[PDB]
Amino acid sequence: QDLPGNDNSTATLCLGHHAVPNGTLVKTITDDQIEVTNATELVQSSSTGKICNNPHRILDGIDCTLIDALLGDPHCDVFQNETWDLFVERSKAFSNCYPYDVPDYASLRSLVASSGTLEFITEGFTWTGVTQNGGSNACKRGPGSGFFSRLNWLTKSGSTYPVLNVTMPNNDNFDKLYIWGIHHPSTNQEQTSLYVQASGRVTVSTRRSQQTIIPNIGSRPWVRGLSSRISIYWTIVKPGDVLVINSNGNLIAPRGYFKMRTGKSSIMRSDAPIDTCISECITPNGSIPNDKPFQNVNKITYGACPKYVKQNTLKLATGMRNVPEKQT
Amino acid sequence: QDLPGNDNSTATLCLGHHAVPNGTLVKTITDDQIEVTNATELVQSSSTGKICNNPHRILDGIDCTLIDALLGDPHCDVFQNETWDLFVERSKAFSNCYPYDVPDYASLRSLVASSGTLEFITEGFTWTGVTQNGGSNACKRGPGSGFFSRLNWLTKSGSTYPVLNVTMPNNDNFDKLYIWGIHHPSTNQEQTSLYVQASGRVTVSTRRSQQTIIPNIGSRPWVRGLSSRISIYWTIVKPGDVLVINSNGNLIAPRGYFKMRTGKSSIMRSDAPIDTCISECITPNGSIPNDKPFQNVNKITYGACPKYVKQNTLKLATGMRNVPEKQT
Amino acid sequence: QDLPGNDNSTATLCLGHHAVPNGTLVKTITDDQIEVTNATELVQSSSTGKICNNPHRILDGIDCTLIDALLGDPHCDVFQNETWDLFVERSKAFSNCYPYDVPDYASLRSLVASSGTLEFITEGFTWTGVTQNGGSNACKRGPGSGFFSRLNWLTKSGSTYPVLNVTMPNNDNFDKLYIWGIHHPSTNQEQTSLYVQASGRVTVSTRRSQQTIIPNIGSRPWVRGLSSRISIYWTIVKPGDVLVINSNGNLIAPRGYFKMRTGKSSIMRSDAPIDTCISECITPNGSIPNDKPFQNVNKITYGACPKYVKQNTLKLATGMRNVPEKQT
Amino acid sequence: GLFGAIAGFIENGWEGMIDGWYGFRHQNSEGTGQAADLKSTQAAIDQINGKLNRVIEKTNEKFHQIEKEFSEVEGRIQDLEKYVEDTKIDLWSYNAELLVALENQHTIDLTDSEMNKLFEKTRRQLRENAEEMGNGCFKIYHKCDNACIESIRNGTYDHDVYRDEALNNRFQIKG
Amino acid sequence: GLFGAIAGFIENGWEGMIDGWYGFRHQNSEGTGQAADLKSTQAAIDQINGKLNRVIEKTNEKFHQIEKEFSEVEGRIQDLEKYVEDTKIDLWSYNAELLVALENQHTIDLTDSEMNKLFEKTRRQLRENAEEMGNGCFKIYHKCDNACIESIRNGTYDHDVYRDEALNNRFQIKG
Amino acid sequence: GLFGAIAGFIENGWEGMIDGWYGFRHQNSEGTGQAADLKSTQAAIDQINGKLNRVIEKTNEKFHQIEKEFSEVEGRIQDLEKYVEDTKIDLWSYNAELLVALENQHTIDLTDSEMNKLFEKTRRQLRENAEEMGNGCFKIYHKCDNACIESIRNGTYDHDVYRDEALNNRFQIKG
Ligand SMILES: *[C@@H]1O[C@H](CO)[C@@H](O[C@@H]2O[C@H](CO)[C@@H](O[C@@H]3O[C@H](CO)[C@@H](O)[C@H](O)[C@@H]3O)[C@H](O)[C@H]2NC(C)=O)[C@H](O)[C@H]1NC(C)=O
Ligand SMILES: *[C@@H]1O[C@H](CO)[C@@H](O[C@@H]2O[C@H](CO)[C@@H](O[C@@H]3O[C@H](CO)[C@@H](O)[C@H](O)[C@@H]3O)[C@H](O)[C@H]2NC(C)=O)[C@H](O)[C@H]1NC(C)=O
Ligand SMILES: *[C@@H]1O[C@H](CO)[C@@H](O[C@@H]2O[C@H](CO)[C@@H](O[C@@H]3O[C@H](CO)[C@@H](O)[C@H](O)[C@@H]3O)[C@H](O)[C@H]2NC(C)=O)[C@H](O)[C@H]1NC(C)=O
Ligand SMILES: CO[C@]1(C(=O)O)C[C@H](O)[C@@H](NC(C)=O)[C@H]([C@H](O)[C@H](O)CO)O1
Ligand SMILES: CO[C@]1(C(=O)O)C[C@H](O)[C@@H](NC(C)=O)[C@H]([C@H](O)[C@H](O)CO)O1
Ligand SMILES: CO[C@]1(C(=O)O)C[C@H](O)[C@@H](NC(C)=O)[C@H]([C@H](O)[C@H](O)CO)O1
Ligand SMILES: CO[C@]1(C(=O)O)C[C@H](O)[C@@H](NC(C)=O)[C@H]([C@H](O)[C@H](O)CO)O1
Ligand SMILES: CO[C@]1(C(=O)O)C[C@H](O)[C@@H](NC(C)=O)[C@H]([C@H](O)[C@H](O)CO)O1
Ligand SMILES: CO[C@]1(C(=O)O)C[C@H](O)[C@@H](NC(C)=O)[C@H]([C@H](O)[C@H](O)CO)O1
Ligand SMILES: *[C@@H]1O[C@H](CO)[C@@H](O)[C@H](O)[C@H]1NC(C)=O
Ligand SMILES: *[C@@H]1O[C@H](CO)[C@@H](O)[C@H](O)[C@H]1NC(C)=O
Ligand SMILES: *[C@@H]1O[C@H](CO)[C@@H](O)[C@H](O)[C@H]1NC(C)=O
Ligand SMILES: *[C@@H]1O[C@H](CO)[C@@H](O)[C@H](O)[C@H]1NC(C)=O
Ligand SMILES: *[C@@H]1O[C@H](CO)[C@@H](O)[C@H](O)[C@H]1NC(C)=O
Numbered sequence A, B, C: 001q002d003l004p005g006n007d008n009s010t011a012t013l014c015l016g017h018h019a020v021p022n023g024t025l026v027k028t029i030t031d032d033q034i035e036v037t038n039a040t041e042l043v044q045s046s047s048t049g050k051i052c053n054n055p056h057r058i059l060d061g062i063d064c065t066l067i068d069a070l071l072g073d074p075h076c077d078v079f080q081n082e083t084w085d086l087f088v089e090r091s092k093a094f095s096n097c098y099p100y101d102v103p104d105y106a107s108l109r110s111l112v113a114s115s116g117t118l119e120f121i122t123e124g125f126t127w128t129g130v131t132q133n134g135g136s137n138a139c140k141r142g143p144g145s146g147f148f149s150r151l152n153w154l155t156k157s158g159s160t161y162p163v164l165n166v167t168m169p170n171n172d173n174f175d176k177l178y179i180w181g182i183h184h185p186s187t188n189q190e191q192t193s194l195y196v197q198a199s200g201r202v203t204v205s206t207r208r209s210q211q212t213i214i215p216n217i218g219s220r221p222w223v224r225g226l227s228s229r230i231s232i233y234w235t236i237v238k239p240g241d242v243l244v245i246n247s248n249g250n251l252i253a254p255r256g257y258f259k260m261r262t263g264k265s266s267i268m269r270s271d272a273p274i275d276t277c278i279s280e281c282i283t284p285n286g287s288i289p290n291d292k293p294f295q296n297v298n299k300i301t302y303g304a305c306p307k308y309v310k311q312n313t314l315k316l317a318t319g320m321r322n323v324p325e326k327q328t
Numbered sequence D, E, F: 001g002l003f004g005a006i007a008g009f010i011e012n013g014w015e016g017m018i019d020g021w022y023g024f025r026h027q028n029s030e031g032t033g034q035a036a037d038l039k040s041t042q043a044a045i046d047q048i049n050g051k052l053n054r055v056i057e058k059t060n061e062k063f064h065q066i067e068k069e070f071s072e073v074e075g076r077i078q079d080l081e082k083y084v085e086d087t088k089i090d091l092w093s094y095n096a097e098l099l100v101a102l103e104n105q106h107t108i109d110l111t112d113s114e115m116n117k118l119f120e121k122t123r124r125q126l127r128e129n130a131e132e133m134g135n136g137c138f139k140i141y142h143k144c145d146n147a148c149i150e151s152i153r154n155g156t157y158d159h160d161v162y163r164d165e166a167l168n169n170r171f172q173i174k175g
């Protein structure tokens, strides 16, 4: 074939792989620190500190909780008919109207918070034989006395409080949320002065349900000059059903209905600053990037967020084992 | 050996593996579509559309909810003492007797639904001084007025409704569920006509517990000619304990006890047809085969069922990688 | 080069691995019984049968439930101001004082159980116009009549029970838990004999909340000679808030406050013997060693315990496959 | 996959092989022939069935559970009912998705392994009489008729019988 | 397992080897002997301990939790309490069962790997002086006394020292 | 790892190789040289990206959930709310921790595999012309200039061209 290759020598070929001077330690099935060429972090552990105002509709509650925005505390009149994807409540919020309590505050806050709208429709209730629009100096609206914008305090007319028995049909094709309440007097004297009967009673019903609440007289702690209280209740009325309000004293009546919807709204307690940026994931600590699969910033989240994990770092190896050639 | 074994030929032997013209794509740790020879589906995604009536005992509620079957709506008298592994409630069910409400409907439905029996024992309660067996035209039993078969409406006798104070010992070795209730009149007039006292009261107690409910007068929405309502309550009496019913007006009294048991019974809302076949897993969409480990038919299941998963397909490779030799 | 000199021969070197005569079967991805050289158990399935009294502070309730220790049943006076990491309640515990019921027994037991202290501070409430320290023969303290050590039964003085309206400020920097209650008479006669008014009323409030409970007259089952009952309620008062107790009859008044704390305390129902040993994990079946990662002893645990698993054995292979010389 | 035989040094599969998963094609004195290897075919099949059977192991049964569909709005307790179920479903869904990923990845490396094991096993048996052409075929340096090819296949080939013929053919030549 | 040495080309284990997990048996003109290989024994042992220690890593501690045993029938809230716990237990049970499956499968392939690595390492060291008999034994084609066998075992064998002796014995013969 | 090439028979990596993950260093008649192998570098990189992309697959989105922070003490319902979340967090934390362990273990065996595959591939191609020095280097028994080293690297080396030269150099010698 070929002729005399006078020289017959050899060659050496060595296969091998890279190594890096630096390198990163990662956990394994068999080791918990083994050094690889490179790795990537899968736990997001820092927030920007600011709630980005985009893409969800953030409504800053300023110094209103959602329930005071709902009831219509004078200072919260700014939120009438407002809407949100996320309502942010602030630690600085305060109520500043008639002292009230809400038996299941936690469910009414939830229920409005995910409906996502404070859209109110006033309805033509006719209260015959009682004085409408009562107010208090603890709920100052402007210079004068006032009360919650969405409720109507009824007191006697002259020398009588009749048995009110009114009805409002749900003729539309959506559910109607009605907020109403009852006034708890401090003294039996107060009771008879305002509502004549020495024992009031409120019964609010639909074809499906009924609540009867009787007021409770007694002194509570002075709050804004008052020892009386009003407790708030709610009734959802389905399409085709009918609300019947029947009372004989102490009724704080509804002025109409909030309309309910179904969506992705929720509420979040946070003093983080809202800022202009687009971020999908919101944490009470501020928005965080959802590029990584897990996060350790907060177990409270809203939006497309990484799954909260107790670990603050988890490195995924993206390279071979680092076996360098120098000493250390 | 031989002698000069001269036949200098060679042979070629090639090892290899099969391949299929078709092939199936499956997900991997490193790829999400890699083609293998064959795979098998692990998500059950279709129902037969029919609830098989075997092996569990399906009781079709027809147009009765379980609570109306329990209380004894005339139209549901069919279910007296009935039993089930799964009670199916239908969207068409309707109540057709005295308008009632059950304060924790959801727990009473649960509690009866897993007891699995409507077995009722009538007990010898003696109501002295009141008229028994009241009925209403809204609960027509046959041509006449009627009421729930398992409850006993007591009204005045002549000019008096005494303080009823009766007792029933649990002397047997099982728990006794008692269903009782109270009648809420529409008018104070109605109250006094029926129960004489202007304010009734029902107190039902055991050595361990007590409930006192006072009725609530007022008009509710006209339902079957009525604005009155009755609310239903329940008391479980343990072996060795004792029931004491004490009332002074408005009591809808128990006629005895339902007996309680412990088993695998539950209830399911479904308009699926019951059919004759044997299937272990029931979904409101109908039975599904539990051969696969996961299912995407419905998160509501009863019986031996695959685990509900959001995925509708997950293919498990059952063959090597498909590397075709052309593809035909 | 190297010069053989004379010998001409070969050698045989065989590589191989150990095998053991015995061997253990373990589960795999592809097999569910494959035999390996050795394995280790990961499910802890046995208890010692005794609750070790170290390192947590076990308080044996002997024949007191935590609520009776809290209220001050005479027989439980042993526990006054006691503290615990784990309160153990025994099946033999019994109450032996005035028949009472607690509307949300389950939350009050929880709330005290994790506070972990029965530390009580007596406060200077002044009840003017009523007789203090009422007791009953059903709560014998020594030879005489008695009542719960931490509550104060008020009855009329002479011919009057005034409207009590007292207040106690939370001026300290911790929350105060107040336990109070109401007495439910058997007869209207009993009501007027003790509290003069034919209808009592208790309203306990803070700036944040209010409860008004009205008593309920009627006979309950004879328990320790009595058909009356008292129901227990609780009010936590935050630093800076104020308690106002206002009543007009039937009040069982607080003698001061329990102080609340936050820690690792909890309660456990167990008849296991407490013994002297150190064990971190406690199960109602007795302590168990937390060396293994999973346990099948009980789903109820307290302390550093393995995760409860339905499996009772899971063997982790710690050796190669066993391929023996003869058999197995 | 990990061993680099399938879709590796063995360029592609044989759609023609219908009688088994792994096997031999040969070209010899009497012509060309194909034949499935049933031992490795059974080895791969048994592991994939074992794996399969563990995954079809017992649907556990559940009876009365919690409500998962509601028609009225209730708030706190209903939000928790819904939240318990939704986090249960996402956890089981994560489980199903990771289970088939691990499983499938392993089935590809396992079947790759078996291919490579049959190759190694045949290599070892031919000893000094064949050379690897590097594409999964051996060049046998001696006359090997159909009975010879059948002894390599059924594992009874005696290399010694052909060692001098092979070593001559293979090396000596002219270098 | 994946490498096919254990319960593979190495027919079976040696119950007699009590001094290590992997090792050698030889028969030369001086005698026969056995000896464990401690490097691969330690390699397999260290990985299995590493694996073991990660699994015995911290039982987390929990204090006040929810009630999990009830004596009265309550309905809605008690059904949820029971359903939270039962779905927690099934999820942790699934986790324990999958964890030991993956783990065990890996421990068998890992120990198989080490067997095969010791084999490869010895193969490479003997260079042109030995042939693989295909059952995990090499045939050394030169006189190798007990010190020679010790040098293969302790990794200091110089193949060059015996290469001409071996190549002669191995090839030349008569073909 | 499982194949024993990386941190195995290949003693250590080359910090100097900046142009790829795997490669060749050679010394021939024309001098010394280094060069990355881009096919296996891309093979390892593509699998690690595939793996990476599956793990960064969709954060699911959740909107109204349950409260997870409370300021007053409530007892039964609040204990359950807290217990639902704490068991959810431990289950997701277990998942994250096991996922990176399995993943990382696999990435090390995978990159070990690719190293070994490139080695095997080069072995097969050199046929009877080179011997394995056992440290990942082959000794080529014939004159192989830079173009020759380039043909082994780009996979076009024809062993036949040098087989007699090599077989002579390799065996004959004097034994
Ligand atoms: C029932 O008892 C409570 C507690 O003792 C009484 O409440 C206290 O009533 C006084 C007089 O109205 C309140 O005085 C007010 O103090 C504020 C400063 O905080 C001052 O600005 C007002 O002008 C007034 O002086 C006091 O705050 C209030 N304390 C509490 C804790 O509520 C209540 O008056 C008693 N009711 C009856 C009918 O006896
Ligand atoms: C309190 O106010 C409510 C609401 O206005 C009154 O309810 C209504 O009462 C009338 C007269 O009984 C009911 O009329 C009947 O309706 C049925 C169906 O249309 C019809 O068949 C009868 O011929 C009659 O018209 C009406 O349905 C009912 N509406 C509602 C929503 O309940 C109630 O009577 C008032 N009560 C008192 C004591 O003032
Ligand atoms: C309302 O009805 C209940 C049930 O009939 C009456 O309860 C029972 O009352 C009697 C008389 O006080 C109790 O008797 C006592 O029992 C103890 C234990 O055996 C014994 O030492 C006494 O000598 C006497 O026999 C009986 O236990 C009690 N039973 C129950 C179940 O509570 C109640 O008295 C009635 N109340 C009125 C005002 O009519
Ligand atoms: C203290 O004086 C006031 C107040 O609140 O300013 C005056 C106010 O006009 C009056 N409003 C009505 C409708 O009567 C209100 C109630 O009497 C009191 O709130 C009952 O609790 O009391
Ligand atoms: C409207 O007439 C009826 C009715 O329902 O048919 C007549 C019926 O005999 C009567 N039953 C009794 C026991 O009194 C009932 C009640 O008075 C009414 O339901 C109170 O709500 O009213
Ligand atoms: C039955 O006699 C007693 C008792 O219990 O021993 C006498 C006891 O001194 C008396 N205590 C007071 C403060 O009045 C108590 C109540 O009247 C009764 O418990 C009301 O339920 O009744
Ligand atoms: C009475 O109100 C409720 C209840 O049980 O609390 C409300 C609940 O949202 C609704 N759920 C669904 C899916 O419709 C349910 C059924 O109507 C009822 O259980 C049929 O038995 O009724
Ligand atoms: C008062 O009723 C209850 C409660 O706590 O609500 C009912 C509950 O089913 C029961 N649980 C068990 C396991 O027995 C419990 C204990 O008896 C009590 O907590 C002992 O402290 O009592
Ligand atoms: C009214 O009491 C509660 C409630 O909602 O039931 C108690 C609850 O512990 C508290 N939670 C926190 C984190 O503060 C909450 C907020 O104050 C309120 O929701 C603000 O809207 O208030
Ligand atoms: C480390 O890995 C990440 C993810 O694969 C990649 O973006 C990064 O560039 C890698 N680092 C280097 C130096 O290649
Ligand atoms: C709120 O919206 C309703 C519906 O359009 C409207 O009629 C009402 O007047 C609005 N009120 C305010 C204050 O915006
Ligand atoms: C996020 O917020 C919580 C509560 O406000 C805090 O404890 C936590 O440490 C914060 N973490 C980060 C990364 O901001
Ligand atoms: C595909 O896999 C399933 C499960 O192993 C099996 O039943 C089916 O027969 C396989 N298909 C073929 C063509 O072998
Ligand atoms: C229901 O079963 C009980 C117990 O045997 C029986 O006494 C009762 O009469 C039965 N009633 C009906 C309607 O079946």
Ligand SMILES: *[C@@H]1O[C@H](CO)[C@@H](O)[C@H](O)[C@H]1NC(C)=O
Pocket: B045, B046, B047, B284, B285, B296, B297, B298
């Ligand atoms: C099952 O039923 C639910 C609700 O009825 C429906 O949304 C779902 O799509 C159905 N799925 C199948 C496979 O029938």
Ligand SMILES: *[C@@H]1O[C@H](CO)[C@@H](O)[C@H](O)[C@H]1NC(C)=O
Pocket: C038, C039, C040, C318, E052
């Ligand atoms: C079996 O494994 C366990 C855990 O590795 C170990 O403690 C035990 O000693 C092993 N058994 C033997 C005989 O080595």
Ligand SMILES: *[C@@H]1O[C@H](CO)[C@@H](O)[C@H](O)[C@H]1NC(C)=O
Pocket: C080, C081, C119, C120, C121
């Ligand atoms: C309980 O502790 C408080 C606080 O030191 C003390 O004042 C009180 O007297 C103690 N009572 C008993 C019975 O130990």
Ligand SMILES: *[C@@H]1O[C@H](CO)[C@@H](O)[C@H](O)[C@H]1NC(C)=O
Pocket: C045, C046, C047, C284, C285, C296, C297, C298
């Ligand atoms: C632990 O206790 C429970 C309930 O007391 C019992 O059913 C269980 O079998 C016991 N298990 C052990 C290992 O003691």
Ligand SMILES: *[C@@H]1O[C@H](CO)[C@@H](O)[C@H](O)[C@H]1NC(C)=O
Pocket: D147, D148, D150, D151, D154, D156
């Ligand atoms: C192997 O093949 C040869 C030729 O067909 C035959 O003689 C021999 O007996 C076969 N052995 C087995 C075990 O099939």
Ligand SMILES: *[C@@H]1O[C@H](CO)[C@@H](O)[C@H](O)[C@H]1NC(C)=O
Pocket: E147, E148, E150, E151, E154, E156
């Ligand atoms: C290897 O074995 C030979 C013969 O026993 C001995 O001379 C040599 O020093 C040994 N080397 C080591 C490192 O043990």
Ligand SMILES: *[C@@H]1O[C@H](CO)[C@@H](O)[C@H](O)[C@H]1NC(C)=O
Pocket: F147, F148, F150, F151, F154, F156
């Ligand atoms: C391989 O290398 C040789 C020498 O550089 C060259 O002639 C040949 O064309 C190369 N082939 C490829 C595909 O690069």
